[PDB]
Amino acid sequence: LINSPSSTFPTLTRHTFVVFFRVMMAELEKTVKKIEPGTAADSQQIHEEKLLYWNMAVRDFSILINLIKVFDSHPVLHVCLKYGRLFVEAFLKQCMPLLDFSFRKHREDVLSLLETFQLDTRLLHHLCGHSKIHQDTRLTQHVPLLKKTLELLVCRVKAMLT
């Protein structure tokens, strides 16, 4: 957006970046789905390795969601509400088991993970509101599933804080 209204990396136009952001969030969703929960007696090295994989998955989620607010073509935010919904579903079914397993030792690491996920939680709240005010028939179907899953993940956050 700075050099040409075309980049320092060709094939990068405003019609092709819809594809680029789609496939970027799709590979990101596929990568966050990778990280599996082990056991409580699992080793500290593997724990640190796969929870740091979680950390880079959620920071990539942060930047993938942060580069929506500039861009348009509602197909973009529709594939975001579709793929980020299965992203938070992956986060439900994979992450919080490791949050319970590796908690009493890796306190700073799981706190860094939850504070990294909470900003993209706020951004997904903002994008659900961005879809609600638009009155889009295609976006307003996938919102209430994402709303109740936000209530499920944040109430599981309130559970683990005890």
UniProtKB/Swiss-Prot annotation:
Effect seen on changing residue 43 to A: No effect on phosphorylation by ATM
Modifications the protein undergoes after translation, according to the UniProt entry: Deubiquitinated by USP1 as cells enter G2/M, or once DNA repair is completed. Monoubiquitination requires the joint intervention of the FANC core complex, including FANCA, FANCB, FANCC, FANCE, FANCF, FANCG, and FANCM, and proteins involved in cell cycle checkpoints and DNA repair, including RPA1, ATR, CHEK1 and BRCA1, and is mediated by FANCL/PHF9. Monoubiquitination prevents DNA release from the FANCI-FANCD2 complex.
Stretches that traverse the bilayer: none
Cell compartment(s), UniProt: Nucleus
Domain of life: Eukaryota
Tissues expressing the protein: Highly expressed in germinal center cells of the spleen, tonsil, and reactive lymph nodes, and in the proliferating basal layer of squamous epithelium of tonsil, esophagus, oropharynx, larynx and cervix. Expressed in cytotrophoblastic cells of the placenta and exocrine cells of the pancreas (at protein level). Highly expressed in testis, where expression is restricted to maturing spermatocytes.
Location of Phosphoserine modifications: 43
Subunit: Homodimer; cannot be ubiquitinated and does not bind DNA. Part of a FANCI-FANCD2 heterodimeric complex that binds and scans dsDNA for DNA damage. Interacts directly with FANCE and FANCI. Interacts with USP1 and MEN1. The ubiquitinated form specifically interacts with BRCA1 and BLM. Both the nonubiquitinated and the monoubiquitinated forms interact with BRCA2; this interaction is mediated by phosphorylated FANCG and the complex also includes XCCR3. The ubiquitinated form specifically interacts with MTMR15/FAN1 (via UBZ-type zinc finger), leading to recruit MTMR15/FAN1 to sites of DNA damage.
Pathological condition linked to this protein in its record: Fanconi anemia complementation group D2: A disorder affecting all bone marrow elements and resulting in anemia, leukopenia and thrombopenia. It is associated with cardiac, renal and limb malformations, dermal pigmentary changes, and a predisposition to the development of malignancies. At the cellular level it is associated with hypersensitivity to DNA-damaging agents, chromosomal instability (increased chromosome breakage) and defective DNA repair.
Task of the protein: Required for maintenance of chromosomal stability. Promotes accurate and efficient pairing of homologs during meiosis. Involved in the repair of DNA double-strand breaks, both by homologous recombination and single-strand annealing. The FANCI-FANCD2 complex binds and scans double-stranded DNA (dsDNA) for DNA damage; this complex stalls at DNA junctions between double-stranded DNA and single-stranded DNA. May participate in S phase and G2 phase checkpoint activation upon DNA damage.
Homology family: Belongs to the Fanconi anemia protein FANCD2 family.
Domain note: The C-terminal 24 residues of isoform 2 are required for its function.
Protein name: Fanconi anemia group D2 protein
Gene behind the chain: FANCD2
